[PDB]
């Protein structure tokens, strides 16, 4: 039926959603939950992370490898580099395709995690409201 998988990155999965400035007014349990809600899963090179404009609702952050950002220009990410964030701002469209430029591996996690936590505590949805609506206030650019 169903079985569980180990985990060795589970302390830089620790840093990585930590490392998260949203997730960053949240508490070590939210934070525990949310790394154990987290899905470890290897991108090879040529493999997709996801498409251009995806369903704002999913995050996903990268371990080892180098990932690159369809757009105007070569964007390239290392390790240690996260996104999705805005997806978990306001599901909003990723607004490019992002894929690994070689043997990458990343996580995802479900918006649906984020929401669980955020529904279950009412702290994190006003803390989450209140970031959002500061971050949907004014973008940054330039």
Same mark, same amino acid.
Request: glycine residues 8%; neutral net charge; aromatic residues 6%.
């Given at each position: 039926?169903?079985?569980?998988?180990? @985990?060795?990155? *589970? &302390?830089?999965?620790?840093?990585?959603?930590? $490392?998260? #400035?949203?997730?960053?007014? %949240? !508490? =070590?349990?939210?934070?525990?939950?949310?790394?154990?809600?987290?899905?470890?899963?290897?991108?090879?090179?040529?493999?997709?992370?996801?498409?251009?404009?995806?369903?704002?609702? @999913?995050?996903? *952050? &990268?371990?080892?490898?180098?990932?690159?950002? $369809?757009? #105007?220009?070569?964007?390239? %990410? !290392? =390790?240690?580099?996260?996104?999705?964030?805005?997806?978990?701002?306001?599901?909003?469209?990723?607004?490019?395709?992002?894929?690994?430029?070689?043997?990458?591996?990343?996580?995802?996690?479900?918006?649906?995690?984020?929401?669980?936590?955020?529904?279950?505590?009412?702290?994190?949805?006003?803390?989450?409201?209140?970031?959002?609506?500061?971050?949907?206030?004014?973008?940054?650019?330039?």
């Amino acid at each position: 039926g169903s079985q569980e998988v180990r @985990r060795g990155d *589970f &302390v830089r999965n620790w840093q990585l959603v930590a $490392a998260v #400035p949203l997730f960053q007014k %949240l !508490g =070590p349990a939210v934070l525990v939950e949310i790394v154990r809600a987290l899905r470890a899963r290897t991108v090879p090179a040529g493999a997709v992370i996801c498409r251009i404009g995806e369903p704002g609702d @999913r995050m996903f *952050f &990268v371990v080892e490898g180098s990932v690159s950002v $369809a757009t #105007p220009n070569p964007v390239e %990410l !290392g =390790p240690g580099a996260f996104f999705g964030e805005m997806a978990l701002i306001s599901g909003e469209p990723r607004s490019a395709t992002v894929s690994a430029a070689t043997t990458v591996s990343l996580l995802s996690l479900h918006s649906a995690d984020f929401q669980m936590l955020c529904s279950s505590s009412p702290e994190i949805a006003e803390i989450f409201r209140k970031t959002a609506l500061e971050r949907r206030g004014a973008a940054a650019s330039a």
